[PDB]
């Protein structure tokens, strides 16, 4: 149904602005809010239908100590949204405490938007893990949202902070945030900073301006993830029906994404399926094995070729995953959007549950434990101090993420009747 | 064939004969079944068409 | 049939002047009394048909110690009415006692006007609750009118004094007036000062000159309430047929009103029905539930759309009321008046019986009881003293309004077979 977006963190507000700009360009919308002259397709999930058919984006921007919001302010696209949903230290506990005291008015804004919406389906989160101000306050808001609304869905888009080092206290912050994400979120879309950075340095020749490109990448991914809802077909035109297949168990809810063209500015679907199963098209980094794989195709498709392609790729066994049970690949189809020039119009997406990200989490589990053992890297922050004088919440999150890694490695085994 | 497909629009009938009747659209159908959840889960011995038509109008 | 208007209180005489000016502008009437050059429609209820077709307003102005009446006197609209119907302390008991001694000649004026009218239907009252001089004398006249004419109708338009404070004795006065209004009136149209003040500060940017705007608001409301009589259709062209549906029981006779444009200087009826059910279009402030709702529409209406709109709004269930029985919404239609420029010509009104005003009454019941308990706020007024040396009439009104609130809360329950 109707989904409200929340955006917080500097990179999160960047990709939210880019996402809304991308959808305004994608649909028949002017940057004033007015419907375009040449506008069939649904805008009834993320866009409020206002008085002059003004598709006002259903978005709530949360920030504290604004810097980039001023750059949002002086823009022609500052008249598309902001019906006054904008509300004005780099520690987790700092942002937690600051969000604690102003929980009421921002929750009042959320309830205001819930009253403004006729229906409700979910709150999708734009998040940056260990982004400083975004950390802690984002976990706090996630806990509040799970508390107040036990009937709605929570989706999280976030990047995982790895740049091969910087901040000595960020693994603690990301660990607490991951503990909150495991318990207080329903489904998590995971992203890696170094992986997207490497792809940006790969297909292009940039080294510094990675933000401006990665905004485009995440915007394309997120819009692709929502295209079958935005452009109505009839397979999984609800969020919940899509998410139900992707989550095999409530302990594994992290989703790996790709994108079939690394650059798209006339191959068949058979080729790009083979491309997508190659890991260079995969944008998120014993044997690691998928549990369940889904793919979504949008382009110029012949309907017989997808069947024979599934036959041939099935027989070729390019799906290097061994499950513990009956779970298999799932196909889906979406519409190519108008008004956008696309060479090689076939474009696909993948949503798969893969165990390999455990190793990435294990990297942080190694790092944090190392800095815990030497104990010269907690640095004695005061917000961390009165929030927890004994710092046993870090031990609690360490317990949870250990259980999580064990659940991962039990899922790697060909039986999940045994647990980890 | 010319007069049949313009004065009576024979082809529009097929296009709406898949999308709706053969359940070819499904934005319509999921909301339709959603609104028809509490009514159709109740036993249909007390079901009369006038309760169906009015909620059908809102759904369409 | 033929209705005579009575106007008393400073704000009541203000809105009476504005109402008569509005109807003179609305109909083909010059401000001398002469029919306009371009004048089909009925003026045979509130306008006497005089010698040169002079539609002389059937109005009786009652005042004591005149101040604003002098401003009425020097006006071009002082020749429309006043065929000598004008007849020259802020306590309830003061105005009661003063009206007591001159009851005879004003009753003689009333009988004179009754003889002047061929038929009679009702006396509609322009009243200001706790307006000082209007209080007490208005209750006295209401009691006299109910006594002398047991065959006629009494309608009361009045505002309820709340400005969030001022006068420490006004809750006593309004309580006695409410006791009289409950027993000696047939139907009451209730208005709130702070609500209309808030709407005036909302749609405009005024803070002081609220009177001049609120006159327009009440005039528009009252004229809208009478339009189907003034502009003849055939549904409820009598007062009594209209009032019969609105009153479900003789204990609940207070009517909530709205107005669909907050400002009207081409939406369909479906939209403005949804607007009218939003409380921002409603001008009067467990669950509070309507008993019976009526609406009146005047504009450019398609007759099939009202049926399908009733279907869709019925199915959407935007009528957040739970009755105890079979009572439902009622639709009505009226004519858009000529000679008045109207953009978005569709304009509607609502008449509904809602329990929420009990809480407002409860606010006064709290306040008066508080000032009764401390007993430093009766102030020992002498008119109050010889009128009642023991002040048990205040206890009597407290008894009645307690019974009234209990009747309200028994009506809130899904059975009214039990009483309160």
From Swiss-Prot, chains A, C:
Any GO BP annotation: mitotic sister chromatid segregation
Pfam families: Tubulin, Tubulin_C
Alphabetical keyword list: Cytoplasm, Cytoskeleton, Disease variant, GTP-binding, Lissencephaly, Microtubule, Nucleotide-binding, Phosphoprotein
Gene3D superfamilies in UniProt: Helix hairpin bin, Tubulin/FtsZ, C-terminal domain, Tubulin/FtsZ, GTPase domain
PROSITE patterns to which the protein is assigned, alphabetical: TUBULIN (PS00227)
Keyword Phosphoprotein part of the UniProt annotation: yes
GO cellular component: apical part of cell; cell leading edge; centriole; centrosome; ciliary basal body; condensed nuclear chromosome; cytoplasm; cytoplasmic microtubule
PTM statement from Swiss-Prot or TrEMBL: Phosphorylation at Ser-119 by BRSK1 regulates centrosome duplication, possibly by mediating relocation of gamma-tubulin and its associated proteins from the cytoplasm to the centrosome.
MF terms (GO), sorted A to Z: GTP binding; identical protein binding; microtubule nucleator activity; structural constituent of cytoskeleton
Binding residues for GTP: 130-136
Modification type Phosphoserine: residues: 119
Compartment(s) of residence: Cytoplasm, Cytoskeleton, Microtubule organizing center, Centrosome; Cytoplasm, Cytoskeleton, Spindle
Entries under PANTHER family matching the protein: TUBULIN
Family that this chain belongs to: Belongs to the tubulin family.
Function, in words: Tubulin is the major constituent of microtubules, protein filaments consisting of alpha- and beta-tubulin heterodimers. Gamma-tubulin is a key component of the gamma-tubulin ring complex (gTuRC) which mediates microtubule nucleation. The gTuRC regulates the minus-end nucleation of alpha-beta tubulin heterodimers that grow into microtubule protafilaments, a critical step in centrosome duplication and spindle formation.
Disorder: Cortical dysplasia, complex, with other brain malformations 4: A disorder of aberrant neuronal migration and disturbed axonal guidance. Clinical features include early-onset seizures, microcephaly, spastic tetraplegia, and various malformations of cortical development, such as agyria, posterior or frontal pachygyria, thick cortex, and subcortical band heterotopia and thin corpus callosum in some patients.
Subunit comment: Component of the gamma-tubulin ring complex (gTuRC) consisting of TUBGCP2, TUBGCP3, TUBGCP4, TUBGCP5 and TUBGCP6 and gamma-tubulin TUBG1 or TUBG2. TUBGCP2, TUBGCP3, TUBGCP4, TUBGCP5 and TUBGCP6 assemble in a 5:5:2:1:1 stoichiometry; each is associated with a gamma-tubulin, thereby arranging 14 gamma-tubulins in a helical manner. Gamma-tubulin at the first position is blocked by TUBGCP3 at the last position, allowing 13 protafilaments to grow into a microtubule.
Name this protein carries in UniProt: Tubulin gamma-1 chain
Species for this entry: Homo sapiens (Human)
Upper classification of the organism: Eukaryota, Metazoa, Chordata, Craniata, Vertebrata
Swiss-Prot record, chain B:
Subcellular location field: Cytoplasm, Cytoskeleton, Microtubule organizing center, Centrosome
Superkingdom of origin: Eukaryota
Tissue expression profile of the protein: Ubiquitously expressed.
Residue ranges the record marks as coiled coil: none
Transmembrane stretches, start-end: none
Assembly: Component of the gamma-tubulin ring complex (gTuRC) consisting of TUBGCP2, TUBGCP3, TUBGCP4, TUBGCP5 and TUBGCP6 and gamma-tubulin TUBG1 or TUBG2. TUBGCP2, TUBGCP3, TUBGCP4, TUBGCP5 and TUBGCP6 assemble in a 5:5:2:1:1 stoichiometry; each is associated with a gamma-tubulin, thereby arranging 14 gamma-tubulins in a helical manner. Gamma-tubulin at the first position is blocked by TUBGCP3 at the last position, allowing 13 protafilaments to grow into a microtubule.
The protein's role, per its UniProt record: Component of the gamma-tubulin ring complex (gTuRC) which mediates microtubule nucleation. The gTuRC regulates the minus-end nucleation of alpha-beta tubulin heterodimers that grow into microtubule protafilaments, a critical step in centrosome duplication and spindle formation.
Record-stated family: Belongs to the TUBGCP family.
Protein name: Gamma-tubulin complex component 3
Gene name per UniProt: TUBGCP3
